Amino acid sequence: TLTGGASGNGTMTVPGDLSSAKFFVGEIYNMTYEFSTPYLKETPPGGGLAV
Amino acid sequence: MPLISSSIPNLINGVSQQPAALRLASQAEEVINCMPSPVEGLKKRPPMQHI
């Protein structure tokens, strides 16, 4: 329920009895990492790198 | 007879007037309306707008 608790706060409902447990509470966020195009690199005659 | 190959690493070195036997092979011969940049290589020049 978005609001409706005491002083307009939000409420949530979970199964079981949690009147004495220890727990956190909060949202969840994602983590995304996209690898690049794999290539080959070698050393040209002039020095340095090339792909 | 070895059938063998090399590569041209970069195209961002512009135009030269030296004889072909003394240049860096990277250097070009005639460049017109190009914008050589190190962030994206060789590209067509930006357009010109009207005010």
Coordinates of C-alpha atoms in Angstrom, one line a residue:
Chain A
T1 CA 0.0 0.0 0.0
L2 CA 1.6 3.3 -1.1
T3 CA 0.1 5.2 1.9
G4 CA -2.3 4.5 4.6
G5 CA -0.2 3.8 7.7
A6 CA 0.3 6.0 10.6
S7 CA 1.0 9.7 9.6
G8 CA 0.7 8.8 5.9
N9 CA 3.5 6.3 5.9
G10 CA 3.7 3.3 3.6
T11 CA 2.8 -0.2 4.7
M12 CA 3.9 -3.7 3.6
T13 CA 2.7 -7.2 4.2
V14 CA 4.8 -10.3 4.4
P15 CA 4.0 -14.0 5.3
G16 CA 5.1 -15.4 8.7
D17 CA 5.6 -13.7 12.0
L18 CA 8.3 -11.1 12.0
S19 CA 7.4 -9.3 15.3
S20 CA 10.8 -10.2 16.8
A21 CA 13.2 -10.8 13.8
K22 CA 16.1 -8.5 12.8
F23 CA 15.9 -7.3 9.2
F24 CA 16.8 -4.5 6.9
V25 CA 14.4 -2.8 4.4
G26 CA 14.9 -0.9 1.2
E27 CA 14.8 -0.8 -2.6
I28 CA 16.8 -2.8 -5.1
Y29 CA 19.0 -1.5 -7.9
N30 CA 20.7 -3.2 -10.9
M31 CA 24.3 -3.3 -12.1
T32 CA 25.1 -3.6 -15.8
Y33 CA 28.6 -4.0 -17.4
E34 CA 28.9 -4.5 -21.2
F35 CA 32.1 -5.9 -22.5
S36 CA 33.6 -4.4 -25.7
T37 CA 34.5 -5.9 -29.0
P38 CA 37.5 -8.3 -28.5
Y39 CA 40.4 -7.6 -30.9
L40 CA 44.1 -8.3 -31.4
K41 CA 46.9 -5.8 -30.8
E42 CA 50.5 -6.1 -32.1
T43 CA 53.5 -3.8 -32.2
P44 CA 54.0 -1.9 -35.5
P45 CA 57.6 -1.2 -36.7
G46 CA 57.5 2.4 -35.5
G47 CA 56.7 1.5 -31.9
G48 CA 53.5 1.7 -29.9
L49 CA 50.5 -0.4 -30.5
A50 CA 48.0 -1.1 -33.3
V51 CA 44.7 -3.1 -33.5
Chain B
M1 CA 57.9 -15.7 -53.1
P2 CA 56.4 -15.0 -49.8
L3 CA 52.8 -13.7 -50.2
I4 CA 52.9 -11.4 -47.2
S5 CA 51.0 -8.3 -45.9
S6 CA 51.2 -5.3 -43.6
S7 CA 48.7 -2.7 -42.4
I8 CA 48.3 1.1 -42.2
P9 CA 47.7 1.9 -38.5
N10 CA 46.4 5.5 -38.7
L11 CA 45.1 7.9 -41.3
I12 CA 45.4 11.1 -39.3
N13 CA 48.7 12.5 -40.6
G14 CA 47.6 14.8 -43.5
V15 CA 49.3 15.8 -46.7
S16 CA 53.0 15.9 -47.6
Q17 CA 55.0 17.2 -50.5
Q18 CA 58.1 15.0 -50.0
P19 CA 59.1 12.3 -52.5
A20 CA 57.4 9.0 -51.9
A21 CA 60.6 7.3 -50.9
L22 CA 61.2 9.5 -47.8
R23 CA 57.8 9.9 -46.3
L24 CA 56.2 8.0 -43.5
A25 CA 53.9 5.5 -45.2
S26 CA 51.1 6.9 -43.0
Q27 CA 51.2 10.3 -44.7
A28 CA 48.8 10.8 -47.5
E29 CA 49.0 12.6 -50.9
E30 CA 45.9 14.8 -51.3
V31 CA 43.3 15.6 -48.6
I32 CA 40.2 17.7 -49.3
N33 CA 37.2 18.3 -47.0
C34 CA 38.3 15.8 -44.4
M35 CA 38.5 16.4 -40.6
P36 CA 41.2 14.0 -39.3
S37 CA 40.7 13.6 -35.5
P38 CA 42.2 11.2 -33.0
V39 CA 38.9 10.4 -31.4
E40 CA 37.2 8.9 -34.5
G41 CA 39.8 8.8 -37.3
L42 CA 39.0 10.1 -40.7
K43 CA 35.6 11.6 -41.4
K44 CA 33.7 13.9 -43.7
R45 CA 34.0 17.6 -42.7
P46 CA 31.2 19.2 -40.7
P47 CA 28.5 21.0 -42.6
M48 CA 28.2 24.8 -42.9
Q49 CA 25.0 26.4 -41.8
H50 CA 23.3 29.7 -42.7
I51 CA 22.2 32.5 -40.3

